[PDB]
Assembly symmetry: C3
Homo-oligomer: 314 residues x 3
């Protein structure tokens, strides 16, 4: 199977500059090489160049709507393209708002996909519920069918077509959630595993349940959108939104390993890696390394070890 | 429901000066305010002024018996008072010896209460078994009915009436126990979950069993006495008696969230926060912050998020 | 029961000087005294003096073969000796290559022993599969019966007799395994619990299974070879080969506590503690302290506490 890396140097989804450097930091760390050592064929499409929309006035509270909307439109085009050729896409972020384009494009080819969202936040805030106009905290709002017309159309997002329903998404690692978002998730009946369910059940059972919930009836391709801040800051400190008490390096890898085993991984997002937020070079290194670690994992690198088939090492 | 904060600036229960500053530190961090944002009605009773007993000669090994016994008599009076008006009491510590008065007062109004003791220590040492005359390591000895008359009456504690039995208490987090204390808990058949049971069962099952054990037959008010050193020093370093290998920030929150869910929380103690033992301002901040986090949790703040009823955020 | 401490100042098993200071650092921390307060009789045999083989040319890739082979022959002699007198041996190391001699000597007296290897690595690499000629990563290759004659005889190891089979060993904590080693363990059907099984099962169930696997049929003496790097670097940073995402301080103690409870502990190795690799004195202290803690644990020190029998503390 085919893997296509696509870099998304975007940061207008939030106030902290730096996430655009994320894809570079990940390649710098040898992401693309390491991936070649796996049983997959890797092709590095490169980084997308996003055209900046001049005079991008805020829509009410929402900041940089047109710039974010346009970059996402371009990214959904690219993703739809590679998905069509039957390759597995891997989007290196930039902030999480780029999940809009990543999942939209993916859905065009695989309309029956399900989403596993690893994050400390829901990021379902609608343009009306945000306390800040930051779009990196609103991705899911634009993607839900049940949230259609529950908010004003925003400049630059008219191309977006609400692709997945509340029954197709599962959250894991939810700790920081706004009142509005919590209202939405309870009202729409969205399945989630906040850190308290992870504590109660154990990562092992959590994955067992998200799979029986999303794949019980029909087996369908999976889109894993991963916000590095879904891990405790002790593992991924270089992110704009650190929340203590998150997933452990082990639980993170555990998930990726289980998802690899389903054989259904179809799309992946490695978001919110911000190199400039590390208080020491080591903090940046720590963050990058585990992100690379989760990616390689999604693809077969097991902690128990790997050996090439047909090779008699004796 | 009513919440009444009562500050207990006491430190004579142990050697290290500093725990008296505990209540101030917690208030500084915005405890009383944040609590106001919850669905509860909050009233801050202020800090109690403890009269120092001059010429407080040690009783054999026990230090400051009269000073400790008196303050505790004063605290029990205040607690019995607020409990009577049907409010939930929250005692901010000083050292853990103040649990004597907190639980005594509480039992006067709710004689059928049960106690969940989160600590790395049992603190059941009797005046005869202590290696140090420190009273912060002897609270439970004065409260157990089964320990009545097994030790000499101590100056200043004649007002205390053994209120709970060995069947009404459950320990969680035990990791540093003295030979004598261990003898006591084994002999009296006190239920406990040391770190090895937590490792074996998982905090989830642990809480399940402490509830079926204490509430299986009769539903009764709960008194949660939390010794901040119950968590690993990595989360609550500013305490006088840190023991490695303790409860994780997540497990602590998990316990409080489950106790909130029972709807039976009646009394709470946030003990042993010593601001002066932090080896960096950050270590003190870390400690205070999680203590506050625990409190807020004991009152409804969920990691999955909280939203106000009847408010349509859309 | 008899305890005999045997120091193994060895470091030629790998490139990083410093592990020879391991036994000194451990005694320095009060290991031998502390172990005295336990219910066991302790005898400190001292540190073995290893004769350095001059003109120790590499055997193909393998470095210091003769020096390592000779030191191990001497250690096996000493261990066979104490085991014979019916005492429990405790080898303080240097590098893990000294497991060859420790287990060989042990097997001479107890041929039906089983081995519980706690390490982040397998260390089964054969002289032909090593990427480096380092022997600390080859111990198990020399001990397996199934690996006999699968590699050239090495200068200095002719005295070694493959004592245990693939059915007699269980790995716990595996996270860093080479392709070759992975091939070997899969091919030979060796039971192991890599970090992912620990994640999935929980340390509690893992121990349950390693015991039903190794002791289900016949109860036999247990040799616990503990590589300190089997725990996460956050607990044992002063080692030559740290791998992130390992066993927690709690899980480590949980293992030793369960092993103590079987009553079958016969041999023990506390390997890879390298004092000179600590980036701060605190890191060295942290490492030593937990190594000491694990040892004391193997011999009865419980987290729930201990009390001497027949002593009425009341
Ligand atoms: Mn986030
Ligand atoms: Mn996100
Ligand atoms: Mn304590
Ligand atoms: Mn206490
Ligand atoms: Mn190792
Ligand atoms: Mn080893």
């Amino acid at each position: 199977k085919p893997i296509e890396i696509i870099g998304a140097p975007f940061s207008k989804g939030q106030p902290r500059g730096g996430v655009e450097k994320g894809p570079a930091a990940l390649r710098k760390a040898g992401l693309v090489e390491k991936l070649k050592e796996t049983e997959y064929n890797v092709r590095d499409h490169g980084d997308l160049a996003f055209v900046d929309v001049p005079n991008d006035s805020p829509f009410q509270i929402v900041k940089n709507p047109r710039s974010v909307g346009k970059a996402n439109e371009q990214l959904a085009a690219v993703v739809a393209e590679t998905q069509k050729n039957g390759t597995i896409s891997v989007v290196l972020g930039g902030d999480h708002s780029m999940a809009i384009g990543s999942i939209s494009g993916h859905a065009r080819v695989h309309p029956d996909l399900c989403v596993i969202w690893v994050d400390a936040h829901t990021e379902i805030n609608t343009p009306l519920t945000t306390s800040s106009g930051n779009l990196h905290g609103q991705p899911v709002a634009f993607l839900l069918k049940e949230l259609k017309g529950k908010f004003p159309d925003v400049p630059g997002f008219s191309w977006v077509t609400p692709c997945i329903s509340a029954k197709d998404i599962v959250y894991i690692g939810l700790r920081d959630v706004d009142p509005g978002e919590h209202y939405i998730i309870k009202t729409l009946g969205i399945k989630y595993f906040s850190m308290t369910e992870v504590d109660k059940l154990g990562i092992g059972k959590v994955m067992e349940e998200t799979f029986s919930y999303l794949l019980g009836r029909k087996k369908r391709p999976i889109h894993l959108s991963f916000d590095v801040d879904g891990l405790d800051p002790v593992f991924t400190p270089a992110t704009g939104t650190p929340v203590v008490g998150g997933l452990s390096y082990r639980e993170g890898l555990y998930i990726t390993e289980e998802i690899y085993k389903t054989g259904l991984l179809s799309g992946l997002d490695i978001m919110e890696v911000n190199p400039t937020l590390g208080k020491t070079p080591e903090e940046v290194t720590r963050t990058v390394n585990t992100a690379v670690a989760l990616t390689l994992s999604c693809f077969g690198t097991k902690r128990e070890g790997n050996h090439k088939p047909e090779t008699d090492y004796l």
